[PDB]
Design a protein around this ligand. Structure first.
Ligand SMILES: C[n+]1cn([C@@H]2O[C@H](COP(=O)(O)OP(=O)(O)OP(=O)(O)OC[C@H]3O[C@@H](n4cnc5c(=O)[nH]c(N)nc54)[C@H](O)[C@@H]3O)[C@@H](O)[C@H]2O)c2nc(N)[nH]c(=O)c21
Length: 149
């Protein structure tokens, strides 16, 4: 499957990604939100590829579609996103992606979820990055979560 072939070292091509990307989006557009298994393989592919091959275009599309699915109750996309955040920022830290991470974590917790908040807590726990400027709201929620975890 392309989602596993494009992850191989030096095994990526826009020729293959264009085809793979279109089948996924079409099946999604055709079968509907959270109905395309091929679209879930694309969420997964983005979660790993963007770690060592960050592309702004891919990332903005990854985040947009993940939030769409999540707004209707399908969370695998948003789960893949928080995974890319938690592990991707641990390998290569980017301030602009770190702020997106905080924004989406706040949104996830305010929607009654804890998956995102655990992944952000996990990031602070393993990256050991100190003097991180954390949004005041997210500090309060992390406090509630440390009491939980
Ligand atoms: C070792 N480790 C653990 N955590 C965190 O701490 C908690 C431990 O419980 P846990 O590990 O038992 O998670 P689960 O309950 O099984 O479910 P779940 O956590 O949902 O599953 C773990 C997922 O991580 C994903 N994973 C492993 N490596 C990678 C990677 O390189 N890239 C991406 N995008 N995902 C990865 C994998 O797909 C898997 O579904 C979990 O929240 C862990 O995430 C870590 N977080 C960071 N930032 N870095 C780490 O090295 C790390």
């Amino acid at each position: 499957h392309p989602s596993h072939e494009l992850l191989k070292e030096n095994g990526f091509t826009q020729h293959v990604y264009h085809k793979y990307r279109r089948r996924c989006l079409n099946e999604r557009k055709r079968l509907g939100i959270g109905q395309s298994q091929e679209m879930n393989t694309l969420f997964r592919f983005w979660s790993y590829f963007l770690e060592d091959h960050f592309n702004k275009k891919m990332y903005e599309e990854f985040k947009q579609l993940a939030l769409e699915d999540a707004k209707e109750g399908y969370r695998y996309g948003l789960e893949c996103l928080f995974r890319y955040y938690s592990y991707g920022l641990e390998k290569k830290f980017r301030l602009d992606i770190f702020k997106d991470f905080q924004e989406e974590t706040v949104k996830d917790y305010e929607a009654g979820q804890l998956y995102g908040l655990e992944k952000f807590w996990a990031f602070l726990k393993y990256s050991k990055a100190k003097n991180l400027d954390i949004d005041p709201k997210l500090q309060e929620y992390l406090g509630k979560f440390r009491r939980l975890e």
